[PDB]
Design an enzyme around this catalytic site. Structure first.
Site, mmCIF file in Angstrom:
data_model
loop_
_atom_site.group_PDB
_atom_site.id
_atom_site.type_symbol
_atom_site.label_atom_id
_atom_site.label_comp_id
_atom_site.label_asym_id
_atom_site.label_seq_id
_atom_site.Cartn_x
_atom_site.Cartn_y
_atom_site.Cartn_z
ATOM 1 N N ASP A 1 0.954 -1.063 0.104
ATOM 2 C CA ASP A 1 -0.139 -0.048 -0.047
ATOM 3 C C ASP A 1 0.972 1.183 -0.247
ATOM 4 O O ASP A 1 2.114 1.227 -0.030
ATOM 5 C CB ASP A 1 -1.166 0.352 1.918
ATOM 6 C CG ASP A 1 -1.499 1.378 1.537
ATOM 7 O OD1 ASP A 1 -1.880 1.384 0.295
ATOM 8 O OD2 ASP A 1 -1.844 1.927 2.690
ATOM 9 N N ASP B 1 0.298 4.670 1.581
ATOM 10 C CA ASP B 1 -0.638 6.204 1.821
ATOM 11 C C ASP B 1 -0.194 5.408 3.514
ATOM 12 O O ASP B 1 -1.505 4.358 4.211
ATOM 13 C CB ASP B 1 -1.471 6.704 1.713
ATOM 14 C CG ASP B 1 -1.344 7.325 0.446
ATOM 15 O OD1 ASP B 1 -0.626 7.904 0.229
ATOM 16 O OD2 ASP B 1 -2.460 7.203 -0.697
HETATM 17 MG MG MG Z 1 -2.580 3.209 3.570
#
Ligand code: MG
Ligand code: CL
Ligand code: CL
Ligand code: MG
Ligand code: MG
Ligand code: MG
Ligand code: MG
Ligand code: MG
Lengths: 209, 209, 209, 209
Positions: free
Chosen positions: D41, D43
């Site tokens: 992922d 962020d």
């Molecule tokens: Mg995230």
């Protein structure tokens, strides 16, 4: 050493890489599994027995560890001084859980063996262990005629072994049993404290009391 | 309640707003000050005495707190069962520091008084307290003829009082003494644990053992 | 270094001897006191400004700290890059508390001064600081014509100074102001993190965000 | 709520039942295994990107979450505002470890897709990812023509997926990949923080920075 050492938020939040578990998670992991043999170390695992060892040290060898080789100490320790040992809450919860499962409960100790012992009775009474689940304490060691903790785990087909010491966990490891660590209380007189998690084993949260 | 509750870094780093202190910081704060009277609570402050209270409860009132009103219990508790009480390291350090200062050391307890007591002797022996600094244990309370912890602090001009309970800290507060909190160990049988710091008082770090 | 280092309950419970405080305790300590001047450091105290300093470092000196001596960097940093700075919750709470008190709010920074700056505007807007309580950012330092953080605290009769760095606390100490420490976030690019509490000063709990 | 809430040693030592791991333990667990696809992922997993989202919120929807549905925001966010995003140390260590292994590195994000994006370039540059190991960022979601995070993990045969959100872990779970949790920093503007460990998954220690 410094008077005002201070701290920082990296240190405040820092976690050791430990596989922590709860009693509930252990029970869940055993869901569906038929009754089996499970085992417990005694000292600093199910009983805070430092009160007796402390009194023993003061009485028989104030200046050394010699009391642990003294048969007069072990007679007292194994035949009544556990009336001053404080049962651990984590052990109440684990024993209750395993009794609920219909498991056979074994206690395996490195305490020196004595002519008689009332430790088995203390454990059954304090933890409300039904006679059907209870087994007399096994005194394991490397003395002639004894068997080691590992050999006893094999002999009794013990599938899970709970303990506070490195030797407890490696006993389980050596025979393919699941070794689960209990934290030794910081007020134990048996020092240094073990490094719980040092073998990548599961460690029970909040198990110091 | 949830099987996998999880956590987050706000919770991991979260600190209660407590004024933590070290023995070294306390000693520094007293630099230059002439010898004075200082006082200590006994149970869960200088001695982990749960072993005796636990044995007492099992023997005299397994189903209630009645043992604490039983003179037969107090006779045993005050005349030998502290041989199983484990001295706290924080107390060794504080007592050593105050003896080094030439301070007068008092012990003030809410234990019920008995015909004789060997607690004073246990404390002097275990903490290596010179006779010149030692004082017999004060049994304080609200019984006829007794004085309260607060009244005794006044009477002996005790300037610092160390204790684990709320009543210890408020005793010091009521008479203008500096009340300093010791953490009760989590394996104490005296529950619930107090909220150390609940009066904005100093709390000694790592003082559970 | 070890793959499985483990831990023990002494380490798990270990506390640094820090005087932790809450915003509520600070407010209580000021109960009754008339309006006064209070001061705040900016970077890692009220703003997480690492985003701008990080971008600045990458753009002007990827291999050194030279960007901090570069006027082209400071122009950008002080005239818009704080739009990417994240206001700290602890600062919202402190500023709100001091505005409620009717206190004068000052910001004192070691950032290099520039022809113009929009930092004062960013701070007033983000923290909803009424014009009556707001004061333009003071750029302090040891450059010719500047005054030091300490001299500015004296000049503005600032009674409380909040900051994350050792120099912030010692600035307050040097002039008899109450220096209160804010924790620098562990994801700050300004490393090493300071030892909060290193001067025996109050440190605000949970003040990393 | 109380001014002086206090604490006790049970609370100080209390641990959530979390399976914590280190980068070293993860690497050890992969010893001998041939190169494979792994995924991250973006962020709060590899980038602290709150600076851009914060600026976006202030600029496009100060009073709501509408900015996240605004194409003008996403253009800025995906084409330069990550210059203010701060790379996480845990991500440097994981990416270095996987590059050392010769693994294929994928980034899978729920950010809204834009005409162009410079995020892939930001990631390759900042984490020093060799072109041979690097893959363009996958923009996953439930928009027409998109595939979900789960579908992409399947498509790319991603064996390990690192992320901070519940949806990241369940994406891995749904396809039989090993989901490993990264802690979201407490100064993230994306609140509430997730409960790391809520699925019994591994959580990387100290991974908030
Ligand atoms: Mg995230
Ligand atoms: Cl503890
Ligand atoms: Cl943090
Ligand atoms: Mg043991
Ligand atoms: Mg303890
Ligand atoms: Mg007490
Ligand atoms: Mg600063
Ligand atoms: Mg942080």
């Amino acid at each position: 050493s410094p008077l005002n050492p201070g701290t920082n938020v990296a240190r405040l939040a820092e976690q050791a890489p430990i596989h922590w578990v709860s009693v509930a998670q252990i029970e869940n992991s055993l869901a569906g599994r038929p009754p089996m043999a499970v085992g417990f170390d005694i000292d600093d695992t199910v009983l805070f027995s430092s009160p007796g060892f402390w009194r023993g040290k003061k009485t028989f060898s104030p200046e050394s560890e010699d009391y642990l080789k003294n048969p007069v100490f072990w007679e007292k320790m194994n035949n009544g001084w556990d009336e001053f040992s404080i049962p651990k809450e984590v052990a109440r919860q684990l024993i209750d859980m395993h009794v609920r499962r219909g498991d056979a409960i074994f206690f395996v100790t490195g305490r020196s063996p004595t002519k008689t012992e009332t430790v088995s009775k203390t454990l059954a009474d304090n933890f409300h262990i039904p006679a059907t689940n209870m087994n007399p304490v096994i005194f394991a060691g490397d003395k002639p005629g004894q068997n080691t903790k590992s050999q006893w785990l094999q002999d009794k087909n013990i599938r899970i072994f709970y303990g506070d010491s490195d030797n407890d966990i490696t006993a389980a490891r050596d025979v393919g049993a699941r070794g689960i660590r209990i934290l030794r209380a910081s007020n134990s007189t048996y020092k240094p404290l073990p490094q719980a998690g040092a073998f990548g084993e599961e460690v029970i949260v909040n198990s110091e009391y």
